Design a protein around this ligand. Structure first.
Ligand SMILES: Clc1ccccc1Oc1ccc(Nc2ncnc3[nH]ccc23)cc1
Length: 292
């Protein structure tokens, strides 16, 4: 049922090695680039699939070129069977790296330094007028080159939505927007089926970094969206910070105060991480947990 068979060759250049990712919206392959001789990420969707996402992904991926923490754009194309985008292949996914950890926790050193990079990548996609709307560990991966193995990359834009018009004015929010992202890391605004803003990506970051440093969220073994929403709406979020650096109270207080229209203070949140590291002699050149 795969769109492309193993060893299938696209535009006489990208040879399919294997499927690496799947789901109702399209498929990701590792391919060999027959020109440059490196392996690449090949994303395909059926030409027939009623919901066409790749055109979104390509537009966002092209707007972000020159920014760090984004895959290099290699190619894109349509035809009778599928559309495709070719981009730089990245390495180990943050979801897998967390799961590999003895306690399913990262050190604070790993956590805070991943935080800085993911926050940069969130500021980046916001700066070109898009929300990610599915910030979660599996949407980030570390590099697979001598030049990138300590760099964290935002992988996918399949759920992104433009929050601006042409001028950089914020779009009117719909009265209701059905939340489409991952239950675990969704803001209370997303659970309430409200138009997501930039703050909702920063909510997802907050929940992700707590899960990194502590190893679980309180609503961990709940897959029912509405249940998870009711737990979050009531949960005393300061509790989440019991075993986090105190500077995170600034992060929490800031994002709790934002609405759909308001531009977040990204430097406030960047400062939380840097001040947290500094208090604790955490250097930028420290091994990540999965090294040694
Ligand atoms: Cl779906 C999943 C769940 C949990 C852990 C790993 C997973 O597998 C993938 C597989 C591929 C990707 N994406 C990518 N990977 C590697 N290089 C890439 N360049 C651009 C995208 C891309 C993401 C998760």
């Amino acid at each position: 049922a795969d769109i492309l068979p193993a060893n299938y060759v696209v535009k006489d250049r990208w040879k399919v090695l294997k499927k690496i990712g799947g789901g109702g919206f399209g498929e990701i392959y590792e391919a060999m680039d027959l020109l440059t001789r490196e392996n690449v990420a090949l994303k395909v969707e059926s030409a027939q699939q009623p919901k066409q996402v790749l055109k979104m992904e390509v537009a966002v991926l092209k707007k972000l070129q020159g920014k760090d923490h984004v895959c290099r754009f290699i190619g894109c194309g349509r035809n009778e069977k599928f559309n495709y985008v070719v981009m730089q292949l990245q390495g180990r996914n943050l979801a897998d790296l967390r799961r590999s950890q003895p306690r399913g926790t990262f050190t604070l050193s790993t956590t805070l330094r991943l935080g800085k990079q993911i926050l940069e990548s969130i500021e980046a996609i916001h700066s070109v007028g898009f929300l990610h709307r599915d910030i979660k560990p599996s949407n980030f991966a570390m590099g697979r080159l001598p030049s990138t193995y300590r760099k964290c990359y935002m992988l996918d834009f399949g759920l992104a939505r433009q929050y601006t018009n042409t001028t950089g004015d914020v779009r009117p929010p719909r009265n209701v927007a059905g939340f489409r992202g991952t239950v675990r890391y969704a803001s209370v605004n997303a659970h309430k089926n409200r138009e997501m803003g930039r703050h909702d990506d920063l909510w997802s970051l907050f929940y992700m970094l707590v899960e990194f440093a502590v190893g679980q969220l309180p609503w961990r073994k709940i897959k029912d969206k509405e249940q998870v929403g009711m737990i979050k709406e009531k949960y005393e979020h300061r509790m989440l910070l019991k075993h986090m650096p105190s500077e995170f109270h600034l992060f929490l207080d800031h994002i709790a105060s934002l609405d759909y229209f308001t531009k977040p203070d990204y430097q406030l949140i960047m400062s939380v991480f840097e001040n947290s590291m500094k208090e604790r002699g955490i250097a930028e050149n420290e091994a990540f947990d999965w090294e040694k």
